[PDB]
Symmetry: D2
Subunit: 255 residues, 4 copies
């Protein structure tokens, strides 16, 4: 009997670090991704990553039911939520641009917890992890849609911890920034963030560790939280951003 995890949007953001490290820790890892609606994309992923179990199901209720049918139960949920950040002055958005952000970044993790929480509560075990964003900690101007939706997700995780603790289910939010996402455009691909001088310099300026975060670092945190080694952190919002933000110092002070 292996523990079963679900990682959503596995090709993007914190998906690969989460899935790879959870598998290394002995989980069966069912993986969701928009591309897995296509048989060829699902099978290519299954061939490259024989330790992972890509699923074709897209919608929350269908995904939870399919993983429960295939593997018995869902022990760990990693809601690795993504949406394209679009920078606009507030008056240049359409209201639908905010609705799109809240559907992808708040309603979707809510729907996944809504669909899985009953089976976890009945057996009094489970772990729920949202991958959110550190942007609420220090917003950039002109990203009001994405940034506020991510904060809704952070508070959703914290609020859920208060009710699910009675059932021995920890709930966590991991909010990254400057997390290297390799080939994925969500949100710091190798090109340009490791390849272009202006981007390399920006990352050195705005993070304390002066580098991007790695998929391994994100995955190590995900597997540590899912292990049951430190459930007493339930309710935490983790800022996985390398010491971002670095705050501009007065004139004359060095870099």
């Amino acid at each position: 009997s292996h523990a079963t995890a679900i990682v959503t949007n596995v090709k993007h953001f914190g998906g690969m670090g989460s899935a790879l490290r959870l598998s290394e820790a002995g989980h069966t890892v069912a993986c969701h991704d928009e591309s897995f609606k296509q048989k060829d994309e699902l099978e290519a992923f299954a061939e490259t990553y024989p330790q992972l179990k890509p699923m074709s199901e897209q919608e929350p209720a269908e995904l939870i039911e399919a993983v429960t049918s295939a593997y018995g139960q869902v022990d760990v949920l990693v809601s690795n939520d993504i949406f394209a950040p679009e920078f606009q002055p507030i008056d240049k958005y359409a209201v639908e641009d905010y609705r799109g952000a809240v559907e992808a970044l708040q309603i979707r993790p809510f729907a996944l917890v809504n669909a899985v929480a009953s089976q976890m509560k009945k057996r009094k075990s489970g772990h729920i992890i949202f991958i959110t964003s550190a942007t609420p900690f220090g917003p950039w101007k002109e990203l009001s849609t994405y940034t506020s939706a991510r904060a809704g997700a952070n508070t959703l995780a914290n609020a859920l911890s208060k009710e699910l603790g009675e059932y021995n289910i920890p709930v966590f939010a991991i909010g990254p920034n400057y997390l290297h996402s390799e080939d994925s455009p969500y949100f710091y691909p190798t090109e340009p963030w490791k390849t272009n001088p202006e981007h390399v310099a920006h990352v050195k300026k705005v993070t304390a560790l002066q580098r991007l975060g790695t998929q391994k670092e994100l995955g190590e945190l995900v597997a540590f939280l899912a292990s049951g080694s430190c459930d007493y952190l339930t309710g935490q919002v983790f800022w996985l951003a390398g010491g971002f933000p670095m705050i501009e110092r007065w004139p004359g002070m060095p870099e």
Copy 2:
């Protein structure tokens, strides 16, 4: 000339405290409310509060447009947002119950700012105030929809402050709890909160001031922020909750 303010949902939550004090400060206060769809309700309100200017418009763009047409411009927006709090374990909600909360508590203030920001930015003046909630500061268990949507609104306000400051527009969020709402059910009506002993005792336990907050206190803060006397607070989330939460102390320690 007169400064013009908009107070939404004026019959509820922080509506009357805001509208009455803004009018005392010399604003023309255009008032929105769902009941003003009915001519008899609008006219009854106008007769009781002849210093206030109730509008029939319901949707955010049409409300901004109607106030702008009637009075020239909108100087102060008070987005007094409401939604009925419904307590449920996460798995007992419908997903639509979260969508309803986000629409009412996040999308609506976004849409109002989206509709009014251009006119404020063009003249480089204006004030934006969201009435949100202090529940994200200390969530109750089983209120995950309402609580997380309110946090999204708080971050929306803070994020907007970063872009609108360049146009001399402060943005504030006032997050109440235990605010006496008189005859309004949103969220602490006189009955039961001043009349039933168990409720009086609860409020004495969980607030530092051991009382409900008053509409006058809320209105004083709204008019102070709208006055242009302290624009340098832009980006603040105010916790208007009387020292809530009081945290349960160890056995043997007194009330």
Copy 3:
């Protein structure tokens, strides 16, 4: 006729607090290190005939002197200052942190410790600390000053929980980029309004792209001390103009 105390009145948030509290009708007893000298006290008294400078320096003696002269202390504005010294952590002396915590934590604690009994007995009073917004977004190499200010913020918030039962609100106002006119604590006119590089820095790091004014600080102090919005008790106010502005990605405009 309500009585206020404003400490370190020549510096930081002192003048804005004292001037606006007097405009609101308070008798404003003013403390300052320079008032140990009669000539400096009397010059201040002549320039500001609406203010009442005191010579007393230590917390117990100051509270006692104001209570004797004016009956009671209704409003305490602990306007605390210390010179920010930037060092790598290993280049400080431990005494440099001790000095910061004495000036920025122990001192407001001692003033509340000295005045709280009289406020509690009559169930009225207002306590305001002027602290700092540096904990909200620390600069590197200011660990002493920044962490002491955070201690003061939590002290205010913790005190609100016990003093609310006695109808005494407690607030912390944490500024940054507050114009301090001729005081070096912490943004004097020269260089912050006069040197182009400093003007440009303020435009970059605040959302309102300017220093905050003494009038804005004083308006908040008088508003809180008025009893018009006691239900904010426990608040830490970030009076920093939308600071911090967070550096955006390459190619995005200023």
Copy 4:
């Protein structure tokens, strides 16, 4: 090659969980304690815990120097700081009661980092962990000294992360509450917190997981952070408090 850790006040608070788990992870763990001034107490500890290395040094600079001399360097500092919480109304404290709290809970971790940072910066490696408190997250009334000093330490850790990241040195604060401390009075000994029904009931009410945190959970987090597996969390303040605080709900709602 063996990494070297220092755990202070090892007999108390998070001392044993930290030291035991770091030793299991392969660190040489030098241990400080006030009782180690006595040769008999140091030797008794060495006999019971032969995998740990108790030191007699008491003062911060002399402790760093003694561990560096004995083992070559200090790779991990765990500043496990303690002070007896004394509840008083603000006017009943002596000012010295606050000075004692700041000296023990702020000056002491500062002094330890001040003494060790140069050797870490020179080799561009090291980890700094403060064990602080979650009391600033939700203060009890009448504990203003201890609570505010702990907040100063949390900010000290966060501020230090901004400068030490350039040297590849993460800085963390772990702020517990309701951490079972076994035989130590700091701060939740087995008697009364597992033996007396009133105390057992209090813990069930005020934490989401309805139990004390374990030394194992604390030690797992300390060893995880010190492993270099997730340096990108630098600057984090961890709330290790089981979902504390639970916020009192309205009359009529169940516990």
